[PDB]
Structure 1
Amino acid sequence: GKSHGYRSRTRYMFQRDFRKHGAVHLSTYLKVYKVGDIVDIKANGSIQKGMPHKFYQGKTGVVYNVTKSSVGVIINKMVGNRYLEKRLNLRVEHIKHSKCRQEFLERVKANAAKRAEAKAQGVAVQLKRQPAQPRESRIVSTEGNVPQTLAPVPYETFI
């Protein structure tokens, strides 16, 4: 018959990695999570308690509950034609903070600093990001850079 267990098809997903097996380092236990933090989920195969299901591997969610050794995380799961709210109790070995959130907060504080310093002059702050604009005019010189003519190479076996 068919087989769809709780950890089916999780072979390479829950292998550890090359040459970093063994016990886990103490930074994962010394990291501090608060309610509202945004965290990434990546399971550790060395810890069998508090494991996430294989669906939530690589998923990103929001902390809603902090307990003794675990963290409650909220994920949005697509079921059919809508998203449902899923609450997960995961031990802290299987989560880490999302770095995109702290990058955005750094942008927020630097952006507020720019607005605050330029508010003393009113110099059209222009605080929105802009994407890659087309590159403008330039003059390239041939002083020591005379062009070298290239041609297609004929065919050879090369074995």
Structure 2
Amino acid sequence: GKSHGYRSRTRYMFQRDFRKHGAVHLSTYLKVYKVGDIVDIKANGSIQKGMPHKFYQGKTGVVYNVTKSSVGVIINKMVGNRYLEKRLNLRVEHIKHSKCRQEFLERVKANAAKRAEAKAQGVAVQLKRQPAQPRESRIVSTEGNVPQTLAPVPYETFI
């Protein structure tokens, strides 16, 4: 018969990162989480208590509770044609502050800066991100860069 245990299929998912077995280093416990924080889940195999079920491996959620040795992360997992809300109780070994919003927070603070500099100066801020534009025209000189003429090569073996 089939087998569908809590940790089935998880040979390498929970594996330990080559040459990085052993006790978890101390910064992992010195980190500090608060409500609203955005964390990424990645289970640590050595720490079997407080583990996330494999489904939330690789997933990113928001902290909704802070307790002695653990955090509560809500995840939107989708079952059927909808999403449902999932409260996870994870130990601090499997959670990691997400840089998925560092750039945004960076962009806000640098956008307040540019805006103050614009308002203190003359107007025309223009601070929305814009996608990769096509190149502008350019002139390419041939000085010391005369074009070489390549041809396709004949068949060979050298086995």
Q: Cα distance, 1:7 vs. partner?
A: 0.3
Equivalents in 2 of 1:32, 1:104: separation in Å? 21
Moved over 6 A (4+): none
TM-aligned CA deviation for residue 69 of structure 1: 0.3
More off after superposition, 115-124 vs 74-83: 115-124
CA-to-aligned-CA distance 1:61-107 (integer Å, 9 cap, x gap)? 00000000000000000100000000000000001000121221011
**Aligned pair count?**
159
SS state at 2:100 partner:
helix
How far did 1:158 drift? 2.0
TM-score (norm: length of structure 1): 0.98
Question: What SS class does the counterpart of residue 47 from structure 1 fall into?
Answer: coil
Corresponding residue of 1:31: 31
1-structure distance, mates of 2:100, 2:120: 31
1:116 Cα deviation from its structure 2 partner: 1.1
Which residue of structure 1 lines up, in the alignment, with residue 11 of structure 2?
11
- Paired with 1:123 and 1:142, the residues of 2 have a C-alpha distance of 42
In 1, the alpha carbon distance for the partners of 2:127 and 2:31 equals: 33
Which structure 2 residue ranges, 5 or more long, are not aligned? Answer: none
CA distance in 2, matches of 1:77, 1:134: 39
| Structure-1 residue corresponding to 2:129 | 129
Structure 2 residue 147 is matched with structure 1 residue 154:
no
TM-score by length of 2: 0.98
Unaligned residue ranges in structure 1 (runs of 5+): none
Shifted more, 95-104 versus 33-42: the winner is 95-104
Query: After superposition, what is the alpha-carbon deviation per residue over 1:120-158, rounded to whole angstroms, capped at 9, x for unaligned?
Result: 123310010001000001000000000000000000012
